[PDB]
Write a protein that binds this ligand. Structure first.
Ligand SMILES: [Cl-]
Ligand SMILES: [Cl-]
Ligand SMILES: [Cl-]
Ligand SMILES: [Zn+2]
Ligand SMILES: [Zn+2]
Ligand SMILES: [Zn+2]
Ligand SMILES: [Zn+2]
Ligand SMILES: [Zn+2]
Length: 129
């Protein structure tokens, strides 16, 4: 069972944030709740996460390429098999995204877009019981 205001799916508790913050601040919020920005590893999970999104706000996910440019990974090191990238992401139609935009976020509709960190957004925290 999950703490209040957290949602359950499978064996994981999810938190859809109310406040918006910088990627690194979002990162630190989940960390101190003993969780981390959400990892999406299956279509079924991705379809569930979307159903939960009532507000149309964009949410940060635990995906970044900051360690090594263009080598997108979940905060646990892993590379995403399953992928739900928007139209020309994350390579930006082959021109390579610009500096700073090394932090991904989910948008209403479900697909992932790579925004620039330091940009403020809502975020999703996740932790496996
Ligand atoms: Cl409540
Ligand atoms: Cl309440
Ligand atoms: Cl996962
Ligand atoms: Zn309540
Ligand atoms: Zn997950
Ligand atoms: Zn939302
Ligand atoms: Zn990058
Ligand atoms: Zn598990």
């Amino acid at each position: 069972s999950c703490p209040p205001h957290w949602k359950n799916f499978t064996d994981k508790c999810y938190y859809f944030s109310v406040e918006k913050e910088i990627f690194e601040d979002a990162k630190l919020f989940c960390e101190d709740k003993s969780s981390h920005l959400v990892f999406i590893n299956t279509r079924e999970e991705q379809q569930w996460i979307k159903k939960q999104m009532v507000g149309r706000e964009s949410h940060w996910i635990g995906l970044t390429d900051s360690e090594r440019e263009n080598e997108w990974k979940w905060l646990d090191g892993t590379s995403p098999d399953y992928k739900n990238w928007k139209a020309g992401q994350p390579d930006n139609w082959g021109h390579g995204h610009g500096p700073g935009e090394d932090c991904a976020g989910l948008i209403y509709a479900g697909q992932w877009n790579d925004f620039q960190c330091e940009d403020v957004n809502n975020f999703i925290c996740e932790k496996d019981r």
